[PDB]
Amino acid sequence: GCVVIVGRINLSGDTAYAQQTRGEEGTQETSQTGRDKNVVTGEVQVLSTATQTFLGTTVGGVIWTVYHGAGSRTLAGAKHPALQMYTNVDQDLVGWPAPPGAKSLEPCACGSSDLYLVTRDADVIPARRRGDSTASLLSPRPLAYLKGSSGGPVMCPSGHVAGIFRAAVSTRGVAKSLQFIPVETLSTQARS
Ligand SMILES: CC(C)(C)[C@@H]1NC(=O)O[C@@H]2CCC[C@H]2OC/C=C/C(F)(F)c2nc3ccccc3nc2O[C@@H]2C[C@@H](C(=O)N[C@]3(C(=O)NS(=O)(=O)C4(C)CC4)C[C@H]3C(F)F)N(C2)C1=O
Numbered sequence: 001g002c003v004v005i006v007g008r009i010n011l012s013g014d015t016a017y018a019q020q021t022r023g024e025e026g027t028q029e030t031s032q033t034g035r036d037k038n039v040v041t042g043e044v045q046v047l048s049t050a051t052q053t054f055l056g057t058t059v060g061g062v063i064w065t066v067y068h069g070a071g072s073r074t075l076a077g078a079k080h081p082a083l084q085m086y087t088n089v090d091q092d093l094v095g096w097p098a099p100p101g102a103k104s105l106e107p108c109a110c111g112s113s114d115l116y117l118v119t120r121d122a123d124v125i126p127a128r129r130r131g132d133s134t135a136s137l138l139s140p141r142p143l144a145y146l147k148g149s150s151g152g153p154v155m156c157p158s159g160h161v162a163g164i165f166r167a168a169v170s171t172r173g174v175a176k177s178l179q180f181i182p183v184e185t186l187s188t189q190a191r192s
């Protein structure tokens with residue numbers, strides 16, 4: 001089937017919030033068709049398949065997300081579904097051309113180690129960067145609270161995107177660190 005945009009998160013300005021755009025029935029129908037009547041607004045899109053829900057982040061004109069969520073599927077669009085311009089299983093990364101209305105986030109270059117994840121519910125979860133692709137949670141939290149936020153943005157204090165949430169370091173139901181796809185990896189991405 002198709003990946004469907006069932007919601008959005010606008011990060012510019014005040015404390016962000018999530019905005020639902022479709023329901024169960026409409027998302028199933030639109031994953032069957034591939035025709036998305038709704039307009040695209042925001043920098044972070046809530047994405048769903050017939051079975052899974054996750055996030056995508058708009059950077060450099062492209063909606064990026066995780067392969068373990070979208071696989072090789074297409075993204076519903078105005079007229080027809082959009083084909084993936086980027087696919088990399090090793091990086092767990094996939095990318096579709098950003099349609100009209102999708103606002104891109106600017107890459108981070110400040111070197112700030114004080115990052116935060118924006119979840120699918122628009123919660124802010126801070127973490128201290130300790131490597132190229134890892135950041136330690138300031139407080140451990142149950143893994144279930146992070147589920148469904150893969151593909152969401154890992155942000156710097158300035159509002160620029162340092163990375164894309166990919167996986168969690170967890171033990172016995174409790175997450176201690178986030179692992180993400182560095183933003184520098186999305187610019188050096190081969191338009192297949
Ligand atoms: C134990 C754990 C937390 C479940 C697991 N940790 C884990 O593997 O830790 C190791 C050690 C340190 C980093 C990581 O190195 C391995 C990298 C794995 C990977 F991620 F690159 C990945 N490449 C794939 C490529 C092709 C096909 C399948 C793939 N499957 C993968 O990983 C899988 C998926 C990923 C996941 O659940 N991501 C999140 C999420 O919310 N998803 S989701 O939206 O609900 C949903 C399932 C709908 C899409 C953000 C974390 C949230 F839950 F916090 N996983 C397992 C984990 O995070």
Ligand SMILES: [Zn+2]
Nearest residue numbers: 108109110156
């Ligand atoms: Zn920055």
